[PDB]
Amino acid sequence: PQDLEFTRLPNGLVIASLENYAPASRIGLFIKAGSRYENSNNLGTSHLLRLASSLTTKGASSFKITRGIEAVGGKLSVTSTRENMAYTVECLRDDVDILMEFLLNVTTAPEFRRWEVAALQPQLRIDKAVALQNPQAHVIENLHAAAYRNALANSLYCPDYRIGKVTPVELHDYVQNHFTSARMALIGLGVSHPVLKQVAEQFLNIRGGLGLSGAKAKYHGGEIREQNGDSLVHAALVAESAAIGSAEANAFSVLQHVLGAGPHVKRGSNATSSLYQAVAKGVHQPFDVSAFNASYSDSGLFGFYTISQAASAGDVIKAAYNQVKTIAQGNLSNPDVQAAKNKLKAGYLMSVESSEGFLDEVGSQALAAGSYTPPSTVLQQIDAVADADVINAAKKFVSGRKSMAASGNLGHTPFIDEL
Amino acid sequence: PQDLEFTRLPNGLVIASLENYAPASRIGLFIKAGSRYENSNNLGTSHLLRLASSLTTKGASSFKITRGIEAVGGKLSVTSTRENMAYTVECLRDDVDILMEFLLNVTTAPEFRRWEVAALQPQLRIDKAVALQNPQAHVIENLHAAAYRNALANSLYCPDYRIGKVTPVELHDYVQNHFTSARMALIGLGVSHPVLKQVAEQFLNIRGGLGLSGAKAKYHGGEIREQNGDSLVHAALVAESAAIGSAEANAFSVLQHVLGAGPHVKRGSNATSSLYQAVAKGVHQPFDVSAFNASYSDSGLFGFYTISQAASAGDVIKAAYNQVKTIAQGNLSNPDVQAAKNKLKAGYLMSVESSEGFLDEVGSQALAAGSYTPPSTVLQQIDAVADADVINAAKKFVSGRKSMAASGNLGHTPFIDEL
Amino acid sequence: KRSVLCRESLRGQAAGRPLVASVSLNVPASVRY
Amino acid sequence: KRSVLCRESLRGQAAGRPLVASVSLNVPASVRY
């Protein structure tokens, strides 16, 4: 009924709200600290920070925090990316208040106690181990540290050597510099904006400029190769995408989808995916491949991802390249761009068809832009992409510094000079 | 009294002998199997082989073999490099026969039992662990794997993920293909050549062509970077040296020494070392740096090594480079080449002033050339280097594809584009 | 570990706003794109 | 682990024939250059 309602304060923190119909409300304070905010000396700190959400804080003891949310059946999620750190908080309409006071302690009143922080430590390993079970994570991580030099090249998981070395003043410092007013954006999916603001005003007024971590971007082509014993090999080939929320970017996204192979059908094969077709024809029976597309504030990464077997690595890898070269040679017919587009458009809408989705979308926008762009408008922008435009972007991957990451038996994985 | 005595057989194995005066004789069968002989599927099998030298074989049980040599106070060393694998055997004049029949079993009659080879496995980790304690080893190793692509970029030490997976058939196959007649060179320091031959003839006649592992060379510029928490940072910078036992090579060697900083004086600083001087002037108080120089059959690596602190890494690194740039700009006066030379000459002589040294030198030559070059001749060759030649070779580093490997806190370590 | 032998492979990463987003929650836990 | 704080550092690798030669012996054991 009522649409969202942004509001930038004197501090510069955004806040939105949508009194929905349904029973479940979800707040989520998105602070602007990503992994990119640590240095050589501070790497691994967000990670631990992320895992230390239920520790004692100034107004609520680790026990009350946990037992409290349990009391009411609430969930507290603490999600991060290379650029941002969403601190989600779900619960029942009636219990927001008990919950909110929890979110506020966790985030503005953390008390990292030598003893508490210390017992966590070991959790980092356990967490790293469980997320490093998907080749995608170690490759995708390897990719970012190869392709960048300094900031976004920092990984989300703490480096093995750092684990126990994460000290309490580190955590305290990171919160202090990054968990501040200018970098924050409250977001409610079932709360009153009037009452939201009041609270925001009372509890979210802290000072801290950007880049006390060392903000800045930079792209550097590079290759990280990880040999294994596994039959299968994964590798990523990616060139500087266009930046976040800009036209070039957007173009990339559309291009991405013309090749982009994220199955829309169970047990079904893509007819639409060019990459898949081209790869497929020159490739063996079992294999899988898809268009990769990442976009951040000050840089992007576009290119593809492959999963081939030992001997097929190159064949697939080049195959995929060659096909994306085709689009860069100019060869791309109108009929396919419109399909793409509609694919994209449908996806973005389904992305936001859920509370969780919507809440992310909104906060996300509040840290980039400073306001909420409605869907429609969104939809318009993607449509504005020219059929050429797409080609042109594509032209840029083929003619843009390469950067690859692979894993598995690398006898048959092309190097930079190979392609 | 009697000088060495080489003899190539019909098989193509080389054998030498020097009845010396003194009480200690030492055999050493050098088989041509280095770490460069393994593939993606075979990596870490030389390593295990190196460590399995006391296992049961056809004529001698592991127990007999070890208690046997103990009996007599012998030592059995199994040394290996990326290109070769020396199997050393020391003991008392009177006991060479008991000992030789051990070397023969160990090398031509290995019996890798599932159970025995399985117990070892864990030794690999222990061995790897102790050797990786010296930054030199992991950096040096990382160097080879970045500068090469296929063969010499294989490290000496088993890859973590392979350890328990090195199978018996693997050992049996590596022995079979590489531990063969054409690749072998016997070498005695206190044995009769007449009686050596006999034995060599009776026990070392096995067939096996080269490259069933996949022999071939190739250089590829690359950078492997290992972040740590250690104050100090090590880094290597190296471009394709000239090959083994060739003029260019030799040149490099001499240039190496002009900059080469291996202290000849305890607690003493080099006045000779250009690199050191130059580095020193632009550098802080505590630091250390040395010219690196590697030469193998089918390629080389020449360039320098640095050990700086976190914020000096670059300064040092560049400083070193610049100075080696100087020589390649032509700036190098005669006085310094002759000192260098004499430094090198001195060095080689001392290198061969020991039994162990001599026996390595001899075998080594056996595997490369096919005969023993006397010292004198050696000495002449090094002298032939031209004062320009040196510069010319140095020109090549500066104008040769770069390849670097660093460890430690890498905030201040130049990348390829940095220098 | 889950065997990845067949045609079924369909994992590659690329979403709209979020990319490689790692969750750690008091109750559940995961890795997405 | 041995502290490497002073001027003493003098480790860097480069020999004649041998380069990065690792020994494993029945009795002793090591890593040279």
From Swiss-Prot, chains A, B:
SUPFAM superfamilies: LuxS/MPP-like metallohydrolase
Short name of one Pfam family: Peptidase_M16_C
Keyword Mitochondrion appears in the UniProt entry: yes
Membrane topology per record: Peripheral membrane protein
InterPro entries xref list: Metalloenz_LuxS/M16, MPP/UQCRC_Complex, Pept_M16_N, Pept_M16_Zn_BS, Peptidase_M16_C
Gene Ontology biological-process entries: proteolysis
Annotated function: Component of the ubiquinol-cytochrome c oxidoreductase, a multisubunit transmembrane complex that is part of the mitochondrial electron transport chain which drives oxidative phosphorylation.
Cellular component, GO, one term: mitochondrion
Record text on subunit structure and interactions: Component of the ubiquinol-cytochrome c oxidoreductase (cytochrome b-c1 complex, complex III, CIII), a multisubunit enzyme composed of 11 subunits. The complex is composed of 3 respiratory subunits cytochrome b, cytochrome c1 and Rieske protein UQCRFS1, 2 core protein subunits UQCRC1/QCR1 and UQCRC2/QCR2, and 6 low-molecular weight protein subunits UQCRH/QCR6, UQCRB/QCR7, UQCRQ/QCR8, UQCR10/QCR9, UQCR11/QCR10 and subunit 9, the cleavage product of Rieske protein UQCRFS1.
Main location: mitochondrion
Designated name of the protein: Cytochrome b-c1 complex subunit 2, mitochondrial
Keyword annotations: Acetylation, Electron transport, Membrane, Mitochondrion, Mitochondrion inner membrane, Respiratory chain, Transit peptide, Transport
One Gene Ontology molecular-function label: metal ion binding
Family: Belongs to the peptidase M16 family. UQCRC2/QCR2 subfamily.
Species annotation: Bos taurus
Superkingdom of origin organism: Eukaryota
Compartments where found: Mitochondrion inner membrane
Modified residues (N6-acetyllysine): K32, K165, K216
UniProtKB/Swiss-Prot annotation, chains C, D:
Organism: Bos taurus (Bovine)
Assembly description: Component of the ubiquinol-cytochrome c oxidoreductase (cytochrome b-c1 complex, complex III, CIII). Subunit 9 corresponds to the mitochondrial targeting sequence (MTS) of Rieske protein UQCRFS1. It is retained after processing and incorporated inside complex III, where it remains bound to the complex and localizes between the 2 core subunits UQCRC1/QCR1 and UQCRC2/QCR2.
Full-protein positions shown: 46 to 78 of 274
Role, per record: Component of the ubiquinol-cytochrome c oxidoreductase (cytochrome b-c1 complex, complex III, CIII). UQCRFS1 undergoes proteolytic processing once it is incorporated in the complex III dimer. One of the fragments, called subunit 9, corresponds to its mitochondrial targeting sequence (MTS). The proteolytic processing is necessary for the correct insertion of UQCRFS1 in the complex III dimer, but the persistence of UQCRFS1-derived fragments may prevent newly imported UQCRFS1 to be processed and assembled into complex III and is detrimental for the complex III structure and function.
Protein's name according to its UniProt entry: Cytochrome b-c1 complex subunit 9
